[PDB]
Design a protein around this nucleic acid. Structure first.
Lengths: 255, 255
DNA sequence: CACAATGATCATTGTG
DNA sequence: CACAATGATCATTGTG
């Protein structure tokens, strides 16, 4: 009854997230950066119709809001199967080139895994849902990510932008990874015996016994939930001695 | 009256050369080499007609002779201006790959020139004519360089080969350079004060005074002539304080 | 004519 | 759609 005891921790029963302890992000620009406004390539009705629902939902969630900005990057329509179902993908390369670089602190999967003793054989793997969106963007940095949105006939002014850390931004993974490390610091202190691996939105909890794991998984879910993050119940691999994590198959302490 | 005192030293007044002190060359093959017989690409009458005179002259000079050999490489027709005058060029790449390598002892022009003191300002530059042909090829190595020759209607059997070091053979420059160094050794001993630079068939004699140079040039011409080599009177740059040598312009002791 | 060497274009895969 | 990255082909220069 996991999806029952921690309703607030699951993306399916807790609604979209928001990292309440994290201050709104300010994105510093390179010293010589000036706004770049790139035209929106015309978009076929089919693509637009495929994308519209996502846009509306994001507007309803306040993740997207209207705006007028000297910045503008293309919105691209991408399909998955072979022709159906679309999803909005923004080309932020021209923006990324104008943002000041930061040191990449996200460890590579290989080194991240080396810190997993053969002693902890019980695993609980969690995937955070819409991780980036949980981090708010400061009003001053929001304009930076604007894009044009046209609705068939009756459509909002023109530009929309994000109020949360967006997909496609070169520093999102790193900024999220550091934010979550700050939010789970105390938790690591209350569970000295537990092993916690973080790779952006992919989490691995390791325990010595199936029980410690159970108690660990509960405390983690409860902590993530109260902090404003959401884990995916559908993918959640709880208290297993074998799990899939970052492309590896963990079992008996191998890989 | 240079072209007069040493008639035997000039290609124009001494006839084709022959290094009388040099034993006929034996060309060692790599341990796994087997004869390679490459077909002769058909040759247009025009090309053949352009090449015929050279072939006949070489046969008359005994530089080419009939033969039957398990080896055979293509003869190619090459023009210089833009359409007229041809000349026979043999593709010996398949043969060169089957011949045992030797250490390249010919110094590069740059290092060769460093050994020219600023003290010797009088130069005499000589170009040996048909240098390679002056070295005989041992009967055992002759078959190696065979090629097919067809004359319009009345033409010799088919294959012809060389009795002298051929053009296109990868070791010709080096073998010639070493042969001439052996033949001019004593000469360098009788003229300790003279500076002699050898680059295959390109020779540079350096003297301190215009006279020593004159006496040097005479002794060199006389020695080359008696040894069987031939210098080109047309290009001969005698006792000059400025000369062209290996792409450089020597003057006042520069370059 | 055949070919080793460079240089130039194209084509393709992964992506924002 | 635009593009950085690789990989693949072609084209060209020098030559035997």
């Amino acid at each position: 009854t996991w999806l029952s005891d921690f309703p607030q921790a699951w993306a399916e029963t807790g609604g979209m997230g928001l990292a309440v302890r994290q201050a709104p992000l300010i994105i510093p620009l390179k010293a010589t950066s000036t706004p770049v406004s790139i035209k929106q390539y015309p978009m076929s009705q089919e693509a637009r119709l495929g994308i519209k629902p996502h846009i509306q939902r994001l507007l309803d969630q306040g993740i997207l809001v209207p705006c007028q900005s000297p910045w503008n990057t293309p919105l691209l329509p991408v399909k998955k199967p072979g022709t159906n179902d679309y999803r909005p993908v923004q080309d932020l390369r021209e923006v990324n080139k104008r943002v000041e670089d930061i040191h990449p602190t996200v460890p590579n999967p290989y080194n991240l895994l080396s810190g997993l003793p053969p002693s902890h054989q019980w695993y609980t793997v969690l995937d955070l849902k819409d991780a980036f969106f949980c981090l708010r963007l400061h009003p001053t940095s929001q304009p930076l990510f604007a894009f044009e949105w046209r609705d068939p006939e009756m459509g909002i002014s023109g530009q929309l932008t994000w109020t949360r850390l967006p997909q496609g931004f070169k520093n999102s993974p790193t900024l999220f990874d550091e934010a979550l490390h700050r939010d789970l610091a105390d938790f690591r202190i209350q569970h000295p015996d537990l092993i916690l691996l973080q790779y952006v939105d992919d989490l691995l909890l390791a325990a010595t016994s199936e029980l410690d794991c159970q108690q660990g998984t509960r405390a983690l879910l409860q902590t993530l939930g109260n902090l404003g993050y959401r884990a995916s119940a559908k993918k959640a691999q709880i208290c297993q001695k074998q799990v899939k994590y970052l492309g590896y198959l963990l079992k008996e302490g191998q890989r």
